[PDB]
DNA sequence: GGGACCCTTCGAAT
DNA sequence: TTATTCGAAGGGTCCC
């Protein structure tokens, strides 16, 4: 298998630059403003000129502004970035039948039947990069390797505006030398759990007792990391099918009053049904984020599709269950629909 | 013993 | 200290 992975560079911020070219060279911060106080909310992403100084995805807006008070702060315009993404994803379809769109700005292409070797793959990556640049003026990073995991690792290493092949012998080097925290799917909690077993590199997973590894991080993650360490990972590139669609909203103030929470929940349902389009869900979950930021959910699978009317009434039940079963005030209320017909 | 869901939480990715 | 989606962990049921 040959996998070519594309990751659009600092995506939301770059789309803003493309639509306002006077922003190029300046720090640009894309923000999710939450409307509870002046500048409440979080940074969705920032360009490399903002990241240079510590302003990055996930930090509070208030903190970003203490670091770079004079950077450009822009509200998130998801709909705009989605349309650009869709167009660039359509460009990528010209280069392979087998394309897995992992997210708004990530796509895996199985190019096994389009290129013979890693050189031809590299040239195809450049072609791809040149094509997106010419059509949309967007720079992307290409990672090329023997599976989806190392193709992604390749892009993580080359970004921004990069292109990198990790050949079969470099895969083997990285199994020993790559810090295991840089493996896709290993975040802070798993990385720390792996350190407390002395596992720093993929290769280290092959000497620990499986049950011990499985005990700490779970069966699937253990099996995942081990298959990688054995150089035996080769998950197929597959068309992703949306399996759920939902909407969650921050309320202006935290609360546990049904009547006060209702309109927010109902707006969330309305937005979700719009996004669902012609899809008909058999499952519904009401999701509450509590005042201390924990997530609590209650749901129900119906034997048949859920009409909006049924969603409205069923969601009130599930919300009451949350209020009943959890003493905490709710900060965020939401709904997710799944198990589509 | 294990299929076939189902429910809620956790952890990770964008 | 945002929003969105995914997959799996464990808890469970009921069922051959
Ligand atoms: C926190 C956060 C990150 N991202 C992504 C994931 C990475 O942190 C970062 C990668 O995208 P970027 O580097 O193209 O901006 O932004 C979002 O799209 N939304 C979010 O809310
Ligand atoms: Ca990106
Ligand atoms: Ca990591």
Kindly list the domain boundaries of chain A, sorted by start residue. 2-10+78-166, 11-77, 167-233, 244-341
Resolution in A: 2.2
On whether the A167-233 domain is CATH 1.10.10.10, my answer is: no
CATH of A2-10+78-166, one of 3.30.70.270, 1.25.40.10, 3.40.50.720, 3.40.140.10: 3.30.70.270
Asked whether residue A32's C-beta has any atom of DNA/RNA strand B within 7 A, the reply is: no
DSSP one-letter code for A180: G
| Residue A292 assigned ligand-binding role | no
| Residue A156 assigned ligand-binding role | no
Q: Say which experimental method was used.
A: X-ray
| Residue A106 annotated in active site | yes
Q: Which of A106, A136, A170, A314 is catalytic?
A: A106
Measured CA to CA, the distance from residue A88 to residue A97 in angstroms comes to: 15
Alpha helices in chain A (DSSP H): 11-19, 48-51, 61-67, 78-92, 118-136, 148-158, 168-177, 188-195, 210-217, 219-229, 258-276, 308-325
Query: Are A33 and A43 a contacting pair, CB within 8 Å?
Result: no
Asked whether residue A243's C-beta has any atom of DNA/RNA strand C within 7 A, the reply is: yes
Asked whether residue A89's C-beta has any atom of DNA/RNA strand B within 7 A, the reply is: no
Measured CA to CA, the distance from residue A323 to residue A333 in angstroms comes to: 12
The CATH fold of domain A244-341: Dna Ligase; domain 1 (3.30.1490)
Closest Cα to atom 8 of ligand 1: A57
């Amino acid at each position: 298998m040959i996998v070519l992975f594309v990751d659009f560079d600092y995506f939301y911020a770059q789309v803003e630059e493309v639509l306002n070219p006077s922003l190029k060279g300046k720090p640009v911060v894309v923000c999710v403003f939450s409307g509870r106080f002046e500048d409440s909310g979080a940074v969705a992403t920032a360009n490399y000129e903002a990241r240079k100084f510590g302003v990055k995805a996930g930090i509070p807006i208030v903190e970003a502004k203490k670091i770079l008070p004079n950077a450009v702060y822009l509200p998130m315009r998801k709909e705009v970035y989605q349309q650009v993404s869709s167009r660039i994803m359509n460009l990528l379809r010209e280069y392979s039948e087998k394309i897995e769109i992992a997210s708004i700005d990530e796509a895996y292409l199985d190019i096994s039947d389009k290129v013979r070797d890693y050189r031809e793959a590299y040239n195809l990556g450049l072609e791809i990069k040149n094509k997106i640049l010419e059509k949309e003026k967007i720079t992307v990073t290409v990672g090329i390797s023997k599976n989806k995991v190392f193709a992604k690792i390749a892009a993580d290493m080359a970004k921004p505006n990069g292109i990198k092949v990790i050949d079969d012998e470099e895969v083997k080097r990285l199994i020993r030398e790559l810090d295991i925290a840089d493996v896709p799917g290993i975040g802070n909690i798993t990385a720390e759990k792996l350190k407390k077993l002395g596992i720093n590199k993929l290769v280290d997973t092959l000497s620990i007792e499986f049950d011990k590894l499985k005990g700490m991080i779970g069966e699937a993650k253990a099996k995942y990391l081990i298959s990688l360490a054995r150089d035996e990972y080769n998950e197929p590139i597959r068309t992703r099918v949306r399996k759920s669609i939902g909407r969650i909203v921050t309320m202006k103030r935290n609360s546990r009053n049904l009547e006060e929470i209702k309109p927010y929940l109902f707006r969330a349902i309305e937005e979700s049904y719009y996004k669902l389009d012609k899809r008909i869900p058999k499952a519904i979950h009401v999701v509450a984020v509590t005042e201390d930021l924990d997530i609590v959910s209650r749901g129900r699978t119906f034997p048949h599709g859920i009409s909006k009317e049924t969603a409205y009434s069923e969601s009130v039940k599930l919300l009451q269950k949350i209020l009943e079963e959890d003493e905490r005030k709710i900060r965020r209320i939401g709904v997710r629909f799944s198990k589509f017909i």
